[PDB]
């Protein structure tokens, strides 16, 4: 029979507008993550977060170890960037594809880099966004689609590396053999037609999928960095 992860792929794209690629991604064993940095030192924030995350998970690869690794990533970024004259930080969305004996697949997320499940041709967002617009979705006041065009969607309500304390969301991922998971920065949904995003995201070869996802975002104007991690489950 089949492994729980069949294959995975990643892509990151600065796009034609931004002066830096302040996104970062990670694909290492059963650990997958995206971090979208912001601010003058946002690239430092996201890269440092993932380096720390990776090391902490490797030292303790279970649910509690993952959550401690996220705390350590927060602390390390805040120690390095907290004395700057303006605020820089990062989002973080991490997936660990644990076996059932370790509680099954888990997502830990802070900010607005979503996790999606792709099943039977449908793409749905599993995480809530910690942004002004995302909170209105969490309040049942606007839809995810409306949140996409909300004029305050760019304003985060939770972020890593901006203070000594963080409260990420933590939850199991309802998924199984045949599903595809996608972690993305918000650049993917900045502008493009949702149908074309789903077309790209359902490409059979995950290496093709990640390339096509970046291209869809770019073709639509590439106003932000776009980073995607695709994981095919067995």
User: Rule CB under 5 A: is residue 135 a binding residue for Mg ion?
Assistant: no
Compute the least distance from the CB of residue 131 to Mg ion, in Å.
Answer: 6
Q: Write b or e for each residue in 215-227: b if 16 or more Cβ atoms lie within 10 A of its Cβ, otherwise e.
A: bbbbebebebbbb
The whole-angstrom separation of Cα 12 and Cα 28 is: 16
Contact yes or no for 90/159 (Cβ under 8 A): yes
Near Mg ion by CB under 5 A: residue from 112, 161, 162, 168: 112
Q: Quick one: DSSP state of residue 108?
A: E
Task: Put residue 179 in one of left, alpha, beta given phi > 0 → left and psi -120 to 50 → alpha.
Answer: beta
Contact yes or no for 180/122 (Cβ under 8 A): no
The pattern of x and - marking residues 26 through 55 that bind Mg ion according to CB under 5 A reads ----------x-x-----------------
Nearer to Mn ion, 135 or 186 (CB): 186
Nearer to Mn ion, 16 or 121 (CB): 16
User: Rule CB under 5 A: is residue 93 a binding residue for Mg ion?
Assistant: no
Stretch that binds Mg ion, among 94-102, 159-167, 186-194, 201-209 (CB under 5 A): 186-194
Residues that bind Mn ion (CB under 5 A): 36, 185-187, 224
Q: Which residues contact 45 (CB under 8 A, 6 or more apart)?
A: 22, 35, 37, 38, 39, 77, 81, 88, 89, 90, 160, 161
Compute the least distance from the CB of residue 185 to Mn ion, in Å.
Answer: 5
Nearer to Mn ion, 36 or 232 (CB): 36
User: Rule CB under 5 A: is residue 12 a binding residue for Mg ion?
Assistant: no
Stretch that binds Mg ion, among 26-34, 66-74, 95-103, 185-193 (CB under 5 A): 185-193
Compute the least distance from the CB of residue 111 to Mg ion, in Å.
Answer: 8
Contact yes or no for 15/218 (Cβ under 8 A): yes
In this structure, the number of other CB atoms found within 10 A of the CB of residue 80 comes to 15
Q: Which residues bind Mg ion (CB under 5 A)?
A: 22, 36, 38, 112, 186
């Amino acid at each position: 029979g089949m492994a729980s992860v069949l294959s995975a792929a990643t892509a990151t794209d600065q796009g034609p507008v931004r002066e830096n690629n302040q996104d970062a991604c990670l694909a290492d064993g059963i650990l997958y993550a995206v971090a979208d940095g912001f601010g003058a030192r946002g690239h430092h924030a996201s890269a440092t977060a993932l380096k720390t995350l990776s090391a902490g998970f490797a030292a303790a690869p279970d649910r509690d170890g993952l959550l401690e690794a996220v705390q350590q990533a927060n602390l390390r970024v805040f120690e390095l960037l907290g004395d700057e004259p303006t605020v820089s930080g990062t989002t973080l969305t991490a997936v660990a594809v644990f076996e059932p004996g370790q509680g099954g697949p888990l997502v830990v997320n802070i900010g607005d880099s979503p996790l999606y499940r792709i099943r039977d041709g449908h793409m749905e967002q599993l995480t809530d966004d910690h942004s002004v617009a995302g909170e209105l979705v969490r309040m049942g006041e606007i839809t995810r689609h409306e949140a996409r065009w909300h004029p305050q969607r760019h304003l985060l309500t939770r972020a890593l590396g901006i203070g000594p304390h963080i409260g990420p969301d933590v939850f199991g991922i309802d998924c199984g053999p045949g599903d595809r998971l996608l972690i993305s920065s918000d650049g993917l949904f900045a502008a493009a037609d949702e149908a074309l995003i789903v077309d790209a995201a359902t490409s059979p070869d995950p290496q093709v999928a990640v390339r096509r996802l970046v291209e869809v975002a770019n073709d639509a104007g590439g106003s932000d960095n776009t980073t995607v991690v695709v994981i095919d489950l067995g």
